[PDB]
Amino acid sequence: MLDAFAKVVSQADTKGEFLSSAQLDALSNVVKDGSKRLDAVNRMTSNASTIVANAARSLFEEQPQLIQPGGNAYTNRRMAACLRDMEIILRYVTYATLAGDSSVLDDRCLNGLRETYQALGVPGGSVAAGVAKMKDAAIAIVNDPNGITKGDCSALVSEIASYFDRAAAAVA
Amino acid sequence: MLDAFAKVVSQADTKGEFLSSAQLDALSNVVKDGSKRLDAVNRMTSNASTIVANAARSLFEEQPQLIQPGGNAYTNRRMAACLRDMEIILRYVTYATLAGDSSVLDDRCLNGLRETYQALGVPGGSVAAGVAKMKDAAIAIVNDPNGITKGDCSALVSEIASYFDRAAAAVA
Amino acid sequence: MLDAFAKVVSQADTKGEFLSSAQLDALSNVVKDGSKRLDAVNRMTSNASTIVANAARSLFEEQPQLIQPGGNAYTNRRMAACLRDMEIILRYVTYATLAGDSSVLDDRCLNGLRETYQALGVPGGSVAAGVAKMKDAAIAIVNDPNGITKGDCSALVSEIASYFDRAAAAVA
Amino acid sequence: MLDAFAKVVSQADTKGEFLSSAQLDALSNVVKDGSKRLDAVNRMTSNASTIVANAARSLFEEQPQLIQPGGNAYTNRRMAACLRDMEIILRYVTYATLAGDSSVLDDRCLNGLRETYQALGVPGGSVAAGVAKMKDAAIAIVNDPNGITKGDCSALVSEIASYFDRAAAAVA
Amino acid sequence: MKTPITEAIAAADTQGRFLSNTELQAVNGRFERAAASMEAARALTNNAQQLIDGAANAVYQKFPYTTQMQGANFASDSRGKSKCARDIGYYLRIITYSLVAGGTGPLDEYLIAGLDEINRTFDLSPSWYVEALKYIKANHGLSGQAANEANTYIDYAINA
Amino acid sequence: MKTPITEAIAAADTQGRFLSNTELQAVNGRFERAAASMEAARALTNNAQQLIDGAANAVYQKFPYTTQMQGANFASDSRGKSKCARDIGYYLRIITYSLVAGGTGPLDEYLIAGLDEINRTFDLSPSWYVEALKYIKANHGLSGQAANEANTYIDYAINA
Amino acid sequence: MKTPITEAIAAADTQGRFLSNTELQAVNGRFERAAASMEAARALTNNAQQLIDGAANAVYQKFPYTTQMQGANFASDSRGKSKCARDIGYYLRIITYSLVAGGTGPLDEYLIAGLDEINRTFDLSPSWYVEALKYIKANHGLSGQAANEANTYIDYAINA
Amino acid sequence: MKTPITEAIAAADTQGRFLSNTELQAVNGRFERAAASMEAARALTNNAQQLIDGAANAVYQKFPYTTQMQGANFASDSRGKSKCARDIGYYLRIITYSLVAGGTGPLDEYLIAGLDEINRTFDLSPSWYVEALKYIKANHGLSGQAANEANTYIDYAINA
Amino acid sequence: MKTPITEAIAAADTQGRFLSNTELQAVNGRFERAAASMEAARALTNNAQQLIDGAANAVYQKFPYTTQMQGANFASDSRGKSKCARDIGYYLRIITYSLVAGGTGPLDEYLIAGLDEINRTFDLSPSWYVEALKYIKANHGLSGQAANEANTYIDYAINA
Numbered sequence A, B, C, D: 001m002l003d004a005f006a007k008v009v010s011q012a013d014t015k016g017e018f019l020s021s022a023q024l025d026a027l028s029n030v031v032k033d034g035s036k037r038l039d040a041v042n043r044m045t046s047n048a049s050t051i052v053a054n055a056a057r058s059l060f061e062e063q064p065q066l067i068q069p070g071g072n073a074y075t076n077r078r079m080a081a082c083l084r085d086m087e088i089i090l091r092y093v094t095y096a097t098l099a100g101d102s103s104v105l106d107d108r109c110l111n112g113l114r115e116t117y118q119a120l121g122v123p124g125g126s127v128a129a130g131v132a133k134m135k136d137a138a139i140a141i142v143n144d145p146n147g148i149t150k151g152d153c154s155a156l157v158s159e160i161a162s163y164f165d166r167a168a169a170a171v172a
Numbered sequence E, F, G, H, I: 001m002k003t004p005i006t007e008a009i010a011a012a013d014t015q016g017r018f019l020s021n022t023e024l025q026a027v028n029g030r031f032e033r034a035a036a037s038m039e040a041a042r043a044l045t046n047n048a049q050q051l052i053d054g055a056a057n058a059v060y061q062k063f064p065y066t067t068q069m070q071g072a073n074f075a076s077d078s079r080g081k082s083k084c085a086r087d088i089g090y091y092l093r094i095i096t097y098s099l100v101a102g103g104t105g106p107l108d109e110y111l112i113a114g115l116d117e118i119n120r121t122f123d124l125s126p127s128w129y130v131e132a133l134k135y136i137k138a139n140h141g142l143s144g145q146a147a148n149e150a151n152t153y154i155d156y157a158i159n160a
């Protein structure tokens, strides 16, 4: 498991050279945006249920056969399992956003998950659609300018969305 | 595990005959040179670190990419592991010299070592070069006539060097 | 194990009342001096060996029979054990200073220690003298105004010294 | 377990002083008589059965009720057990003679043996008589001047006999 | 109890070593946040009675049947009103305890571990207290990160 | 590797739960200290060569026999001087790595785990490098808490 | 096989360390005694046939019935005499092996582990070979410590 | 304690048997080497003070800062000089103990098991004592195998 | 599934024996109660829509904010009303399943094992459905022991 500092240190050690001014500047920018990153992580974790609810609402709205008799979640068990899956994926996205690196999300979650879903018979495309809707809802909620000090969070939003396409592409 | 006496006794027992005067003379010569053998073993063990240092210095002098970035020992771990390997090989050479037989060195060390080195990706040729440099340094140090009583140690030097080519040929 | 906040919260919960303005003011003062407390803890831990050395020097200077033949530490074993004991006591003092409460030092260290020392035959009075000399050396080192921003650390010094008499009185 | 060198080193270390010329001279005399000591140990161990036989013959000659019906060894079991006991005591005497110190004989053999014999009902006085006869036979056999180089072994004989009275007094 | 400082000390002690720079960094974070935590605690303690009365009235206006239906589990008379004010006082008291301690420890230990059996037995619906805590959150008068901290623990309270 | 952030994430993951307020406080401490950590790293990296040369000369003046006695393990010629400068460069490089990472991880992993066998084999006395690091600590030109951080890790380096 | 040198090497190897001064002292003792051991081996090997014939004749004179009674287990004819000479030759051969090796290893391994079942099955009394070895011990012509060594191993042979 | 004789006796006792020829050979080696061991011990004990003073002066000339810098861990005054002479005396005393005992036992038990914590705590660099022991090794005035034995144990002392 | 008959058969089979008189008595009790159970199931199934609409209207009158406040988790528009009717239909359907089966099996398996995570995620308060089930219990039109059975399972439903 690596974060940004650990990745930079490993890549500089394997080559045996001091850190260039570029890497120092990048890590100093990471440090400067650390407070925005903590804001994003706190807001995403403490509003996790609302994000999951919005994503599920959209997914069941555009693919209603999912919640109709004979569908792939027409019961308390499968509904709760889908919601657990969605909360898990959001939790690992919050991990990657706090770490500033996708290594934990790729290695511990996105490895072998695609095989699991097609072995279980769960349609992966609808999972990817739900993940994209999670991305939309999460970015909408993070950028909410109320109750906070005005500022630019565009880089973090881009990074979090990049994590989301990495998650969606690992099951599509 | 055999020494010279045990090897001679086994070979004479498998044929069922008394020891010939040739074998008796050879073993009596071994007994007569026992003190020189103890001198060689003591000097080689109590100066082991200097021998390893000289060998490593020569090896890194003629193959400097070993200690340059990207090389096969450019770190505390791989450096210490190479030095441990070198000290191990010297220790087993001291075992064989004290025993007056290569059986321990062949059976317990040189069996499967070549497979280990190519499975690990360590270049065996440079290992053989380092072993040859150990041979040169050890023979130089053993023959040092200072602090000791004048005498002929040429047979022991030849035998120890023979052990060294057996070691170097087992990994080359 | 309690710190100041936990002690205040427990004592207020057992009585069932909100925190009075007195306790709030006291805890706000603790918060305000938190940075001085971190300075004290860092300087005491990173200079622990010098403190132990000074204390041991004074103790052996005023009680030289300790380091004379027949004394209670005239060997590598007993010397190293005394130094280990001294480093342990200083470590638990640093714990109590960081916590702002003596509960850890009393419950986990000062309970049954006096019985241990008289059962072992180690003279507890000289241990108390060494503890007092540790107090003097530690307070001297903490108040050093060099390399730091000018300010008042008298309350922390009094508190740390109070921990020291609690330690010295538990073995005297 | 201590030998003479270890005892002298411990007693000099507990006082913290170099070895006096007296102790050096005593240990040098021990070294000088080491060859006589090895002769005594070898002759006593390789003739152990003859010593036991002579001792048992004398003991049964002067106390014949031991080997008469109703006696305390009138059977293969008790006879063999007595001979085992006698061989054990002689073996530990050979240990103490080789070590040049009675510590092994006292600590590992003579501790609690007297209680064992009176708890078993074996008459300890006759055991002491047999031990004294072992002393006589062993000293007779050790001093035999045939097959060896002429020399003085009086000090070793006195020491071995001292071990024997220590053994006999531990059960009498 | 479960505070960051006690947790750091226990982590350091379990491995028998001096305190590391990581634990001092964590204690530094605790000390820097304790200013806002104590400000929020002081504010919530000073305006306690106003908040209690406002929350009780919000509960009455939101669930009117609680003032109309007869029955012991309701607030149709003075005894019910006083019990409800006492309950909301317990809630606010323990949330201020947790704000003071700097963690969920007091909430985990003094309230949540027994609230469920209490509410089932006496037929008290959790949504009443949910609405009371929502009112308190919307009307505590705090601003900035101190308010953020208060809201963090209030949301911890909401997940009854 | 052992960083505070990775340690917090692993603690949160091992119990299968979202991140708690304690871990966010710890990451806040890390982020606030990373400013001084990065300032110290940048300073030590920019003035690297001056520090290397000054430390080498301090070693030569303090242990003069190292410049006089013949033998391969000494710095009597140019090869020894260059090897010593390379060694001090390795030391400074790994200390800057550790300052960047914010923990003892890089020092524990890349230097200390193998330094002892290396020094025994090639007859290199640790006090040479101790004196070099003492010089670097006394002559890095940093002020305040950034200097304090640098000195923390330099003292970590001293306990070879 | 069980020699002092192999035992020392195995002791040193089992703990993964270089050879200690104690093991070199033991090997020194082995080397100093090997001179007498080899002298005794050479002497016993050169005069082998004389010793064999003398031991056979001693057995015949001591137990006369072995030359008189008929039966396959006796030496009443030439076949028995030749078998007995072969047997005593085996005994002397293995004792010389043990003298060469410097330990009881060869005697423990090649003779004693199977002698008992052999002697019970073919009705060979051990006292015959005891008397033969006693004769060999009294008539080997060795003097001093070499003779002492030979007698040590001969007594090892006696305890059949 | 760990002597060859005690080790042989313990090996013989653990298997409940008489002493074998191998153990007597080992004790013979011990007895033959004890002559040189005792000669070396006597020599090192007689010339103790000369060696102590020469080693102290060698330390002062080799590391001159130890005579110049102020501070309690140095030998700038008479107290430091006397402490250093006492220390070198302890070293020589325990090496002579080990020479007398014939093994590394006393060195393993009375010095090495506690030297590391002592030296770290009082900021005593091991290279001082390394240089002192090197001087003692180069200036003990012994010749032949007795000198070889002394040097064996001195090198055991060097690997602090 | 967990029915009395299947439980009796499994008890009889686990001990490898024929059915005992106790199990036949239990099956007799099941058969005698199944008449009332089936009457209650038929009644609740026939008047399903009337009960659904009455329960929805009771929920609206009891918690008026659910018809007024905007937000997706409310029944302010037609979509919310239809979802709520579907939910109450699920509840009634599974209670009739359980009445048919004669045990809590269907309620334990198809509803209760997943209701809690569903309600927390979509912010649905259990008291809404509690009030709906209370209305259904007070307005099912059953009389006697069949009504008693229905109320038994309705109270099982209440303890959400």
Ligand SMILES: *[C@H](C)[C@H]1/C(=C/c2[nH]c(/C=C3N=C(/C=C4\NC(=O)C(CC)=C4C)C(C)=C\3CCC(=O)O)c(CCC(=O)O)c2C)NC(=O)[C@@H]1C
Pocket: A066, A072, A073, A077, A078, A079, A081, A082, A083, A085, A086, A088, A109, A113, A116, A120, A122, A123, A126, A127, A130
């Ligand atoms: C919901 C968005 C979709 C879907 C979900 C669904 N899943 C199951 C079962 C499983 N889901 C997982 C996923 C994970 N388990 C982990 O530990 C992790 C990482 C930490 C992940 C990502 C797994 C392993 C399973 C199988 C084992 C289990 O259930 O725990 C079901 C049930 C299928 C069935 O009952 O036949 C469902 C329904 N269904 C949808 O319709 C959505 C597209």
Ligand SMILES: *[C@H](C)[C@H]1/C(=C/c2[nH]c(/C=C3N=C(/C=C4\NC(=O)C(CC)=C4C)C(C)=C\3CCC(=O)O)c(CCC(=O)O)c2C)NC(=O)[C@@H]1C
Pocket: A035, A036, A038, A039, A040, A042, A142, A143, A144, A145, A148, A149, A150, A151, A152, A153, A156, E033, E145, F021, F024, F025, F028
């Ligand atoms: C980005 C998504 C949005 C945003 C971020 C933003 N916040 C500030 C204010 C701050 N928020 C924090 C966060 C924490 N402090 C803690 O102790 C904890 C854990 C309990 C957290 C999560 C901090 C430290 C600050 C700075 C101090 C303050 O109170 O203001 C800013 C301005 C200051 C800055 O960027 O450093 C910004 C930009 N603002 C937006 O507009 C985005 C939508």
Ligand SMILES: *[C@H](C)[C@H]1/C(=C/c2[nH]c(/C=C3N=C(/C=C4\NC(=O)C(CC)=C4C)C(C)=C\3CCC(=O)O)c(CCC(=O)O)c2C)NC(=O)[C@@H]1C
Pocket: B066, B072, B073, B077, B078, B079, B081, B082, B083, B085, B086, B088, B109, B113, B116, B120, B122, B123, B126, B127, B130
């Ligand atoms: C140094 C001269 C060369 C070289 C060495 C090197 N080795 C490794 C790892 C291993 N070395 C061994 C050898 C032995 N282990 C034994 O027990 C014995 C006999 C008792 C021998 C001879 C083994 C088994 C390994 C693998 C397991 C281990 O490391 O302990 C490395 C590390 C490789 C890496 O990190 O990728 C190195 C570098 N490297 C050189 O450049 C020299 C040619």
Ligand SMILES: *[C@H](C)[C@H]1/C(=C/c2[nH]c(/C=C3N=C(/C=C4\NC(=O)C(CC)=C4C)C(C)=C\3CCC(=O)O)c(CCC(=O)O)c2C)NC(=O)[C@@H]1C
Pocket: B035, B036, B038, B039, B040, B042, B142, B143, B144, B145, B148, B149, B150, B151, B152, B153, B156, G021, G024, G025, G028, H033, H144, H145
């Ligand atoms: C051969 C590499 C060099 C050499 C050997 C040499 N040595 C002697 C002297 C002796 N060295 C020993 C060794 C030991 N005695 C012990 O107790 C121990 C273990 C602690 C050891 C290792 C011995 C016994 C002797 C003989 C007695 C003496 O002190 O002289 C000689 C001459 C005597 C002989 O060969 O037997 C020789 C030749 N000399 C060289 O020139 C070689 C470089």
Ligand SMILES: *[C@H](C)[C@H]1/C(=C/c2[nH]c(/C=C3N=C(/C=C4\NC(=O)C(CC)=C4C)C(C)=C\3CCC(=O)O)c(CCC(=O)O)c2C)NC(=O)[C@@H]1C
Pocket: C066, C072, C073, C077, C078, C079, C081, C082, C083, C085, C086, C088, C109, C113, C116, C120, C122, C123, C126, C127, C130
């Ligand atoms: C040194 C200042 C004094 C003194 C010390 C001394 N101690 C021993 C042995 C022990 N010391 C302790 C103390 C502790 N062990 C713990 O775990 C803790 C708290 C975490 C404490 C405070 C204990 C338990 C022992 C006995 C077990 C052990 O040794 O580990 C000795 C050795 C005594 C001897 O060898 O006979 C000494 C010398 N001696 C002095 O002169 C000082 C006054």
Ligand SMILES: *[C@H](C)[C@H]1/C(=C/c2[nH]c(/C=C3N=C(/C=C4\NC(=O)C(CC)=C4C)C(C)=C\3CCC(=O)O)c(CCC(=O)O)c2C)NC(=O)[C@@H]1C
Pocket: C035, C036, C038, C039, C040, C042, C142, C143, C144, C145, C148, C149, C150, C151, C152, C153, C156, E021, E024, E025, E028, F033, F144, F145
């Ligand atoms: C009291 C013993 C002495 C003293 C204390 C003092 N320090 C400041 C400066 C500061 N020291 C710190 C400490 C840390 N920050 C961290 O991140 C860590 C862990 C890595 C530590 C240990 C801090 C935060 C400050 C304030 C910021 C700054 O750099 O100045 C002061 C003045 C500011 C204050 O008190 O808050 C004081 C008084 N000064 C003395 O004179 C005493 C001898």
Ligand SMILES: *[C@H](C)[C@H]1/C(=C/c2[nH]c(/C=C3N=C(/C=C4\NC(=O)C(CC)=C4C)C(C)=C\3CCC(=O)O)c(CCC(=O)O)c2C)NC(=O)[C@@H]1C
Pocket: D066, D072, D073, D077, D078, D079, D081, D082, D083, D085, D086, D088, D109, D113, D116, D120, D122, D123, D126, D127, D130
């Ligand atoms: C013979 C000289 C005398 C005597 C001997 C006798 N002993 C027993 C039984 C025992 N002898 C011992 C002694 C030892 N066991 C040990 O391990 C050691 C040290 C290593 C010693 C010294 C013990 C313990 C016993 C009891 C257990 C056992 O038998 O092994 C008997 C048998 C008594 C009986 O059968 O009733 C005898 C006869 N008897 C004599 O007449 C002599 C005086």
Ligand SMILES: *[C@H](C)[C@H]1/C(=C/c2[nH]c(/C=C3N=C(/C=C4\NC(=O)C(CC)=C4C)C(C)=C\3CCC(=O)O)c(CCC(=O)O)c2C)NC(=O)[C@@H]1C
Pocket: D035, D036, D038, D039, D040, D042, D142, D143, D144, D145, D148, D149, D150, D151, D152, D153, D156, G033, G144, G145, H021, H024, H025, H028
């Ligand atoms: C004392 C009981 C009697 C006695 C002793 C004696 N022996 C010598 C001769 C020697 N005996 C040995 C012994 C051994 N060498 C080995 O290798 C082994 C183990 C296999 C043993 C047991 C030795 C080394 C000697 C010296 C060399 C030699 O062959 O002569 C002497 C004279 C020499 C001396 O004392 O050192 C003596 C006195 N003689 C008596 O009269 C006592 C009855």
Ligand SMILES: *[C@H](C)[C@H]1/C(=C/c2[nH]c(/C=C3N=C(/C=C4\NC(=O)C(CC)=C4C)C(C)=C\3CCC(=O)O)c(CCC(=O)O)c2C)NC(=O)[C@@H]1C
Pocket: E059, E066, E072, E073, E074, E075, E079, E080, E081, E083, E084, E085, E087, E088, E090, E091, E094, E110, E111, E115, E118, E122, E124, E128, E129
């Ligand atoms: C007020 C918001 C609503 C409500 C209040 C009410 N409560 C009771 C009785 C009890 N309330 C509690 C709650 C707690 N006691 C504790 O110690 C803690 C931990 C901090 C809590 C959360 C309890 C235990 C009881 C029963 C025991 C007691 O009386 O103390 C009543 C009376 C109900 C009755 O008598 O049956 C009422 C009315 N009811 C409403 O209608 C308000 C909206």
Ligand SMILES: *[C@H](C)[C@H]1/C(=C/c2[nH]c(/C=C3N=C(/C=C4\NC(=O)C(CC)=C4C)C(C)=C\3CCC(=O)O)c(CCC(=O)O)c2C)NC(=O)[C@@H]1C
Pocket: B053, B057, B060, B067, B074, B075, B076, B079, F059, F066, F072, F073, F074, F075, F079, F080, F081, F083, F084, F085, F087, F088, F090, F091, F094, F110, F111, F115, F118, F122, F124, F128, F129
């Ligand atoms: C300089 C301060 C003193 C000193 C330097 C010196 N070193 C050598 C050889 C080596 N130095 C190292 C150290 C490291 N290599 C690594 O990868 C790491 C981890 C970051 C470290 C700490 C090593 C391994 C060697 C040996 C292999 C090599 O050459 O690279 C020499 C030459 C000694 C010789 O050839 O025998 C010297 C001179 N010596 C002094 O006198 C300076 C005071």
Ligand SMILES: *[C@H](C)[C@H]1/C(=C/c2[nH]c(/C=C3N=C(/C=C4\NC(=O)C(CC)=C4C)C(C)=C\3CCC(=O)O)c(CCC(=O)O)c2C)NC(=O)[C@@H]1C
Pocket: G059, G066, G072, G073, G074, G075, G079, G080, G081, G083, G084, G085, G087, G088, G090, G091, G094, G110, G111, G115, G118, G122, G124, G128, G129
């Ligand atoms: C001679 C001293 C007395 C004796 C000899 C005798 N032996 C046989 C037959 C056998 N002797 C042996 C002994 C060994 N064979 C081995 O390999 C070894 C290990 C070194 C030993 C000790 C054996 C095995 C036999 C039987 C098999 C064989 O013949 O080789 C005979 C013939 C008896 C018969 O045929 O039944 C005799 C006569 N008998 C005497 O009277 C001599 C005094």
Ligand SMILES: *[C@H](C)[C@H]1/C(=C/c2[nH]c(/C=C3N=C(/C=C4\NC(=O)C(CC)=C4C)C(C)=C\3CCC(=O)O)c(CCC(=O)O)c2C)NC(=O)[C@@H]1C
Pocket: C053, C057, C060, C067, C074, C075, C076, C079, H059, H066, H072, H073, H074, H075, H079, H080, H081, H083, H084, H085, H087, H088, H090, H091, H094, H110, H111, H115, H118, H122, H124, H128, H129
């Ligand atoms: C002299 C070579 C250098 C040196 C000496 C020095 N030592 C101290 C204090 C101590 N020396 C020891 C060493 C031992 N004590 C033992 O029992 C043993 C086992 C045999 C050893 C190895 C110890 C324990 C101490 C501290 C306790 C004591 O004083 O006895 C000083 C004083 C330092 C101070 O007071 O802080 C000095 C000067 N220093 C030099 O500069 C010399 C080169």
